[PDB]
Design a protein around this ligand. Structure first.
Ligand SMILES: *Cc1c(COP(=O)(O)O)cnc(C)c1O
Ligand SMILES: *Cc1c(COP(=O)(O)O)cnc(C)c1O
Ligand SMILES: [Cl-]
Ligand SMILES: [Cl-]
Lengths: 386, 386
């Protein structure tokens, strides 16, 4: 099995990713396409391999956080549409056009200036644009129908630009109170209706994240944006508890025990601060993961890992590259034993959702902060590769 | 100025790094060498350029977490000794010898099996080895005098291995109560004098981290391991408040404002959960950093950034790639304005230590979890590069 110098790694099960895409595809209208959201390194799962697999098994397009993230995917040989969800500086319009990356924008001046840059540099290829309509997320986007109309006109008069989509974002679609989500939807449809009455033909309309796709599939329009769900993780407990789609978590995080010892001699202090004192016959195992890997320092004397199918506790403080766990009095364990940090082992499981609960955050943060110094392995048709 | 598509970046000031080295050099005994600790991507500062600068201005060796971190430095052309501080699997003994990387070990069996690998292929450089003595950190290392002597005898009998150092690690040297630190030091000295009693000549002795180098310079022996202090950060408030060495923070984290808007029309909800509602005259600025960059989601309705020399609050929750901040009612701010997330701006400052306090953690974690998708720029002799 796996040969590493530092024995910590991630396994991403692409069979689960396939099953997750299939469950969303089967839930939303047949006509709606799927945009796989692969921002922040594929939510820390690895953007390239997740994107490739998604596009083979149901997705038509990709979304990323930045041009640089889109260029990584092109260089991997990917030809599918790639949308940048955040703001792109005009300094990168030339480059984005050359690599066929679609940018989101929502301001007249940006449209006009981007067009001028491309004109001045000769316009080899046209830049694809989606317009962001801000209906309540308050992050990016145009906020009134009149300004929206001016943005559309500016985009349409820009011969070096090409309008390929229009979208909005739901800020509370994963919550039990649906009031705001319905108001956003209504506002979005009203803005789109305003354009049509002006005689404007709409490009691809999309509004659903994972949450809205599950709870409001009728809003799927031309396309949804599948993020967290692709990775087999629900956007909230509430959406999971609707029991409408079955998702399988794709990521696990593992290590091998670096050293095992019985704490026979004094002092029996463990890790920084000496916050934990072992018994004389207690067995302490050291593991090559720490907080610079994204294993939160707040799991100090709190977290659990799986060893031989059972939960064993973090002992003392998490350090930058290493943790210690207790195998208990005369506990059995040997250097080289596999430990599961996030995921399943024999009958047991420590899910990313449970870790996120421990830490008062959400599964999105737990997986997307996994350091790139952890190597990722991929499982497809039941066997591993990189 | 910098041209980026996504306008968030790190600046690492190598003039500050030079000073910091010089301040520590001037403080510890003049015979003592400095091993610069550039593990975990130079504590998030970039391992290569920090290592390079350090080796030019006072450091003679480097420390890393893994063989692979050491290989990164070798590929950049660094030829100085590199010590791996954690456990290295026997599957990487051959590779470490080819790349002239020094490994930590502390078990008879490991010495013997590693030596056996190398003999079978008698054609590589002699794998340098440091022995780790565990005097109370309880993480890695040999814990008794008897066992230390066997390990040393095994290493010496292993002709394809070369003993080049021996060390221990202090678990509470940054704390006001120095009792455990003095006991660790005493124990380490006692083991070493035990070896000398056997007729054994000692290689390079090192035990000090940044804390002990500052509070116990008399413990510097042949070499210290300079980590947090290299980056201009103190290992604890207590050590800082001793006022014995003047350190200058090397890292700042910056962005440019992506969009500015006045929240004139309903809904004035900001970011996920709608946890923040803006006034009709309040100005909201959107910034291209989020929790996948390492900007903790726990800063959601708490954090601050600097804009035009003043502290402005994070408004609503932190998202994966973006945050929103309030420039407050009326406004004064423009798209493209520079914001400082960690660091100084005019008279104002948000230090990494202050961020760590807010998050109940330590400056080590705050900097070492900065994502590699943030580009790092370096300042040397007052001018930027990369
Ligand atoms: C990150 C992001 C998504 C991903 O949605 P999930 O909630 O992860 O399904 C969707 N839309 C926007 C606008 C985003 O930034
Ligand atoms: C991480 C580490 C250091 C760095 O020390 P600081 O001064 O705390 O940065 C030193 N020594 C060892 C063995 C380490 O693992
Ligand atoms: Cl948005
Ligand atoms: Cl150690």
């Amino acid at each position: 099995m796996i040969k590493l110098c530092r024995e910590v790694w991630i396994e991403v099960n692409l069979d689960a990713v396939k099953k997750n895409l299939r469950a969303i595809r089967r839930h939303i209208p047949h006509k709606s396409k799927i945009m796989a959201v692969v921002k922040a390194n594929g939510y820390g799962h690895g953007s390239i391999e997740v994107a490739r697999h998604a596009l083979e098994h149901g997705a038509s397009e990709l979304a990323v956080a930045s041009v640089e993230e889109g260029i990584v995917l092109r260089k991997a040989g990917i030809t599918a549409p790639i949308l940048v969800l955040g703001f792109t500086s005009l300094s990168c319009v030339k480059k984005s056009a050359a690599w066929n990356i679609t940018l989101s924008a929502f301001q007249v001046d940006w449209m006009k200036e981007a067009n001028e840059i491309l004109e001045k540099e000769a316009s080899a290829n046209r830049l694809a644009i989606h317009i962001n309509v801000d209906t309540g997320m308050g992050r990016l986007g145009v906020r009134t129908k009149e300004e929206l109309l001016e943005v559309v006109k500016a985009l349409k008069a820009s011969k070096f630009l090409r309008w390929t989509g229009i979208f909005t974002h739901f800020s509370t679609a994963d919550e039990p109170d649906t009031t705001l989500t319905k108001l956003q939807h209504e506002k979005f449809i009203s803005f789109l209706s305003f354009l049509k009455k002006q005689g404007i033909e709409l490009p691809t309309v999309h509004m659903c994240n994972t949450a809205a796709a599950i709870a409001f599939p009728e809003f799927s329009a031309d396309m949804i944006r599948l993020g967290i769900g692709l990775y087999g993780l629900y956007p909230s407990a509430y959406i999971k508890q609707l029991n409408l789609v079955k998702l399988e978590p794709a990521l696990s995080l593992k290590a091998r025990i670096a050293y095992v010892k019985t704490m026979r001699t004094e002092p029996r202090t463990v890790s920084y601060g000496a916050t934990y004192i072992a018994e004389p016959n207690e067995v302490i195992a050291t593991l090559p993961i720490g907080y610079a890997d994204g294993y939160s320092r707040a799991l100090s004397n709190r977290g659990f890992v799986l060893h031989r199918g059972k939960r064993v506790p973090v002992a003392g403080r998490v350090t930058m590259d290493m943790i210690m766990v207790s195998l208990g009095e005369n506990g059995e364990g040997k250097q080289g034993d596999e430990v599961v940090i996030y995921g399943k082992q024999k009958g047991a499981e420590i899910s990313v959702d449970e870790v996120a609960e421990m830490l008062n955050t959400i599964n999105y943060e737990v997986v997307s902060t996994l350091s790139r110094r952890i190597p990722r392995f991929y499982i497809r048709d039941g066997e591993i590769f990189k």
